[PDB]
C-alpha cells in the first residue's frame, strides 16, 4: 500500500519535539506555576 507521506515520521510532519505547558509567575499574589513538558508518541509511516 503506497501510504501518503510514506517513510515520514511524526516529527517529519512538523510535530513539536516537546509540548511545554505555560508557566505563571504572578508576583503580587506570590503564585508560581512550573512549565510541564510532555513528549509526543513517536511513529513512522511505512513507505509500502
Amino acid at each position: 500500500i503506497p501510504l501518503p507521506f510514506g517513510g515520514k515520521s511524526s516529527r517529519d510532519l512538523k510535530m513539536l519535539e516537546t509540548v511545554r505547558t505555560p508557566a505563571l509567575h504572578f508576583k503580587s499574589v506570590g503564585f508560581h506555576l512550573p512549565s510541564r513538558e510532555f513528549q509526543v508518541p513517536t511513529f513512522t509511516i511505512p513507505k509500502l
Partner: protein
C-alpha cells in the same frame, strides 16, 4: 491641577501608570514576531515541497514501470518530458503593467520560484516591484528593519512621495507620545 491636593495625587497616579505602560512598551517588537512567523511559514513551505518532490519521484517511477510493463516507455518518456517541461505562460499586458512570463511544469512548481507581478495597487500610485521569491527558502528570508514604499496619492488628486516604513520608528513615536504625557506637568506635547 498641580495647585490642588486631589488633582496632584491624580496626576501622580497618572504618571505612575504612564511609567508602567512605557516600561511594558519596551518589551514589544514587531520585527522579531514577524521574523518568527516568516520562519514558520518558510518551514511549512520547505516540508510541503519536500513531500511534493518525494511524491513526484514515486509517481515518475510508477509511470516508468507501468510503461515498461506496457512496452510504451517511449511514450512515458514523452509524457515525463511534458510534465517536467509543460509550457511557459506568456507575458500578459495590462494598463497597470505587464505580468511576467512563468513556467508551469511540475518541476517549475517543485522549485516553487515565483515572479512577483508588475502591479499597481488600485486607487494609488504604488507600483509593487517584480522580483523572484522562493517559498522553500522563505524560511531563510528575513524581515527588513525598514523599507521604502512607492509614491502615494490621496483622493487621486494630491501626491505623496515615497515614504519609509520603519518598525522602530512607529514604536518609538508611540513611546515618545507616552513620555510627552509623562512630561506634561507644565508642557504641551509637540505638534509633530
Amino acid at each position: 491641577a498641580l495647585s490642588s491636593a486631589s488633582l496632584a495625587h491624580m496626576k501622580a497616579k497618572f504618571r505612575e501608570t504612564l511609567e508602567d505602560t512605557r516600561d511594558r512598551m519596551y518589551q514589544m517588537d514587531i520585527q522579531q514576531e514577524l521574523q518568527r512567523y516568516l520562519s514558520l511559514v518558510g518551514q511549512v513551505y520547505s516540508t510541503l515541497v519536500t513531500y511534493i518532490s518525494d511524491w513526484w519521484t514515486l509517481a515518475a517511477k510508477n509511470l516508468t514501470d507501468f510503461a515498461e510493463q506496457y512496452s510504451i516507455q517511449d511514450w512515458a518518456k514523452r509524457m515525463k518530458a511534458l510534465v517536467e517541461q509543460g509550457f511557459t505562460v506568456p507575458e500578459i499586458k495590462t494598463i497597470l503593467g505587464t505580468m511576467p512570463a512563468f513556467e508551469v511544469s511540475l518541476q517549475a512548481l517543485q522549485k516553487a520560484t515565483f515572479q512577483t507581478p508588475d502591479f499597481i495597487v488600485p486607487l494609488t500610485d504604488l507600483r509593487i516591484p517584480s522580483v523572484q521569491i522562493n517559498f522553500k527558502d522563505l524560511k531563510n528570508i528575513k524581515i527588513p528593519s525598514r523599507f521604502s514604499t512607492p509614491e502615494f496619492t490621496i483622493l487621486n488628486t494630491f501626491h505623496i512621495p515615497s515614504f519609509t516604513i520603519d518598525f522602530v520608528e512607529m514604536k518609538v513615536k508611540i513611546i515618545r507620545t507616552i513620555d510627552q504625557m509623562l512630561n506634561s506637568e507644565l508642557q504641551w506635547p509637540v505638534p509633530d
